[PDB]
C-alpha cells in the first residue's frame, strides 16, 4: 500500500534517492535508469512508482498515460498569503543567453552559431528554441542550423553532440542524464560559460542562481551577471535582469507524474515526506533537505520551495496548456498521437 519507487536518472540522482531512501525508513525506496524516457517506461511496468519530469517529458509520459500529481513551486511576491501548496504555479522563463562580450550576436545571426541545450526533447532547452527555429525557417533541417552543439540525447555520432564532454574520463558523451558536464540547466549554463558554445537555451533563474558568487563552484564563483545578456525575439539584447520583457516563452512547471492508477497514493506519501524534508521540514537542515543538492537539481531543482497540490485535477493537456501543445506538435511532425513505447 504505503511505499513508493522512485526512478532517479543516472548515478548521481541514484545516491540522493539512496539518502532520501535512508531516512525514510524505506517509505520511499530507488529505481535506477539511464534515461528518462527509461524511468517512464519504468513507471509504465510498474517497476517505478513515480518522477519529477520537465514538461518536454511531461508530453511523452502523457501520451503513453502516465499523470501529472504535483507540481514544483518556487519563491513567489504574488500571493503572499496563500501556502506554497494551495498557492499556484506561475511557470519559469525559458531564455537565449550569451556573452555580453559577443557583441554583435542576435537572434538574428544565430545561424551557424555554437550552441548548448539542457538536452533533446525539454521545454526552454530544446522545444520553444528549435520550435521557433524551425517555423522561422520554414524547415525541418534543425540539425543544420547551428554549427556544433550540444544537446543531449542526440546521435552521439552526430554535429549535435559535438560539443558535450561527457563524464571524467571522457565516457558516456551526450547522454542525457547529470553524467554528461553540458546536461541539464546547470550544465548547458557552464556550456556557455566556459565559452565551449555561443549561446545557451535554458531559464532566467538558471543565470542569477549560478552568478555573482551565488554558486561557489570552480567554474562558476567569478562569473558576473553583467557579463550576460538575454536574445529576445525582436532582435534586440538585454540585460538578465529585464527577463519579463525578453524571453522565449514561458514554460509550466516540473511535475511529478505516475500512473493514474497510482497517483492518489503517490501524492500522499510525497505530501508527508515533503512535511519532513520539505523547506521547512522536521527534518530537513538537521538530517536530510529533499530540495537540496549542490546547484545540480537532483530530481528536484534546488529552488524549488515545495511540491504542490494541483487543483483541477488537471490532465497532462491540461497542466502543459493548450499553448505548448501545439508547440511540440508541431516540431514532432518534423522527427501523430500514440506515445513512444
Ligand atoms: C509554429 O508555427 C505553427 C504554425 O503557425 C504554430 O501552430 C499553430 O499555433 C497556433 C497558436 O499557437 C494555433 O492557433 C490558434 O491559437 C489561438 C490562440 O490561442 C486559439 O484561439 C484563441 O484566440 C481567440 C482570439 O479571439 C481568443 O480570444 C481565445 O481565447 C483563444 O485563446 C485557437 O484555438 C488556435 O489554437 C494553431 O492550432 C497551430 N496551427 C497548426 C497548423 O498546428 C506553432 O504554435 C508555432 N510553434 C511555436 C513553438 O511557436
Ligand atoms: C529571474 O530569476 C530570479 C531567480 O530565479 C527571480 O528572482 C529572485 O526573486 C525572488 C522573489 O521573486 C527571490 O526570493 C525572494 O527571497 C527573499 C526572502 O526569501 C525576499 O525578501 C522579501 O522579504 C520581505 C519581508 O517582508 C518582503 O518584502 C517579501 O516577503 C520578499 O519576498 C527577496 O527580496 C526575494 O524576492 C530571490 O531572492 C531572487 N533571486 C536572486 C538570486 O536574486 C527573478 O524574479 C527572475 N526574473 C523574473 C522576470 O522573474
Ligand atoms: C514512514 O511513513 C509512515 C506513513 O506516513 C510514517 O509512519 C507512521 O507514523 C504515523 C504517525 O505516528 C502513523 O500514522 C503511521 O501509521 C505509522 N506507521 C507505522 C505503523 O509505523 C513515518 O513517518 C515514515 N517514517 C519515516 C522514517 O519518515
Ligand atoms: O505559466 C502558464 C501555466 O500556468 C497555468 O496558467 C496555471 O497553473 C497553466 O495552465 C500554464 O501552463
Ligand atoms: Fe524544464
Ligand atoms: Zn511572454
Ligand atoms: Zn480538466
Keep these: 500500500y504505503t511505499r513508493v519507487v522512485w526512478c532517479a536518472v543516472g548515478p548521481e540522482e541514484q545516491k540522493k534517492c539512496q539518502q532520501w531512501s535512508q531516512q525514510s525508513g524505506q517509505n520511499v525506496t530507488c529505481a535506477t535508469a539511464s534515461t528518462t524516457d527509461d524511468c517512464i517506461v519504468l513507471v509504465l511496468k510498474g517497476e517505478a512508482d513515480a518522477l519529477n519530469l520537465d514538461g518536454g517529458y511531461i508530453y511523452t509520459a502523457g501520451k503513453c498515460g502516465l499523470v501529472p500529481v504535483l507540481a514544483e513551486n518556487r519563491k513567489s511576491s504574488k500571493h503572499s498569503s496563500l501556502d506554497c501548496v494551495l498557492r499556484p504555479t506561475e511557470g519559469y522563463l525559458a531564455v537565449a543567453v550569451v556573452k555580453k562580450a559577443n557583441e554583435g550576436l542576435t537572434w538574428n545571426s544565430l545561424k551557424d552559431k555554437k550552441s548548448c541545450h539542457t538536452a533533446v526533447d525539454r521545454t526552454a532547452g530544446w522545444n520553444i528554441p528549435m520550435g521557433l527555429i524551425v517555423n522561422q525557417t520554414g524547415s525541418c533541417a534543425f540539425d543544420e542550423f547551428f554549427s556544433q552543439s550540444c544537446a543531449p540525447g542526440a546521435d552521439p555520432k552526430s554535429r ?15 547522454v542525457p542524464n547529470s553524467k554528461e558536464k553540458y546536461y541539464g540547466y546547470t550544465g548547458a549554463f557552464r556550456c556557455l560559460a566556459e565559452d565551449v558554445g555561443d549561446v545557451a537555451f535554458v531559464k532566467n533563474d538558471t543565470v542569477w542562481e549560478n552568478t555573482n558568487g551565488e554558486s561557489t563552484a570552480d567554474w562558476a564563483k567569478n562569473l558576473k551577471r553583467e557579463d550576460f545578456r538575454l536574445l529576445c525575439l525582436d532582435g534586440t539584447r538585454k540585460p538578465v535582469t529585464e527577463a519579463q520583457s525578453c524571453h522565449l516563452a514561458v514554460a509550466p512547471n516540473h511535475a511529478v507524474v505516475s500512473r493514474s492508477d497510482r497517483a492518489a497514493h503517490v501524492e500522499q506519501v510525497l505530501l508527508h515526506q515533503q512535511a519532513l ?27 524549488t520551495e515545495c511540491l504542490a497540490k494541483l487543483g483541477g485535477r488537471p490532465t497532462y493537456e491540461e497542466y502543459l496548456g493548450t499553448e505548448y501543445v501545439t508547440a511540440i506538435a508541431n516540431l514532432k511532425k518534423c522527427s501523430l498521437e500514440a506515445c513512444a513505447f
Design 160 to 174: 549535435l553532440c559535438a560539443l558535450c564532454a561527457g563524464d571524467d574520463q571522457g565516457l558516456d558523451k551526450c
Design 277 to 303: 524534508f520539505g523547506k521547512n521540514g522536521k527534518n530537513c537542515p538537521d538530517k536530510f533537505c529533499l530540495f537540496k543538492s549542490e546547484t545540480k537539481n537532483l530530481l528536484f531543482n534546488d529552488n
